[PDB]
């Protein structure tokens, strides 16, 4: 079983450089937990649809097209993966 420590894998410098790309000047210290909570929610929403697509396909692995369809059904179409 994979432990819950993986949420800490999204490092503070990684979040900081994401904010830098987004155009943020400076970041409060309380953000870094809010951001990973938001990321966890978003990933749960996408993966829930991906895995059910795979289950309906009766496969044991998750393909790229499953993720593409899951994103498409949420109005988040992704180009570059067929």
């Amino acid at each position: 079983k994979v432990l819950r420590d993986n949420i800490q894998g999204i490092t503070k410098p990684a979040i900081r450089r994401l904010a830098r790309r987004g155009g943020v000047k400076r970041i409060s210290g309380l953000i870094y937990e809010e951001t990973r909570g938001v990321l966890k929610v978003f990933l749960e929403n996408v993966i829930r649809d991906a895995v059910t697509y795979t289950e309906h396909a009766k496969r044991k692995t998750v393909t790229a097209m499953d993720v593409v369809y899951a994103l498409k059904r949420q109005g988040r179409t992704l180009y570059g993966f067929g």
Binding site: K1, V2, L3, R4, N6, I7, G9, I10, T11, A14, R17, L18, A19, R20, R21, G22, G23, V24, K25, R26, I27, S28, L30, I31, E34, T35, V38, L39, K40, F42, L43, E44, V46, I47, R48, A50, V51, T52, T54, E55, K60, T61, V62, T63, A64, D66, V67, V68, L71, R76, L78, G80, F81
Partner: protein, 97 residues
């Protein structure tokens, strides 16, 4: 000695990261996070590398958009420091919560 005043390094980081297209998160911890999340929906699932890359691309784009919106909100609050109030406001307005 030599000491850049605060802000200049932030501005040059903004310019640098707004000019490149590389991923900003580490592949291995992102994969571990994805596998941890997915194990509850169904155990012992396997993933394609392209699938993980697509997930990471989508997540990074979503976070960048959210950060742009929250920066706009913080500026609207007559500030320059992003704080979770701004993130919550942007999430609520965009109908995500």
């Amino acid at each position: 000695p030599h000491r850049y005043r605060p802000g200049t390094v932030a501005l040059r980081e903004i310019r640098r990261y707004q000019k490149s297209t590389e991923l900003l998160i580490r592949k291995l911890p992102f994969q571990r996070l994805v596998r941890e999340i997915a194990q509850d929906f169904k155990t012992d699932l396997r993933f394609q590398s392209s699938a993980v890359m697509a997930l990471q691309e989508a997540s990074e784009a979503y976070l960048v958009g959210l950060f742009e919106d929250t920066n706009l909100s913080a500026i609207h609050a007559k500030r320059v420091t992003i704080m979770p109030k701004d993130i919550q406001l942007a999430r609520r307005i965009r109908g995500e919560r």
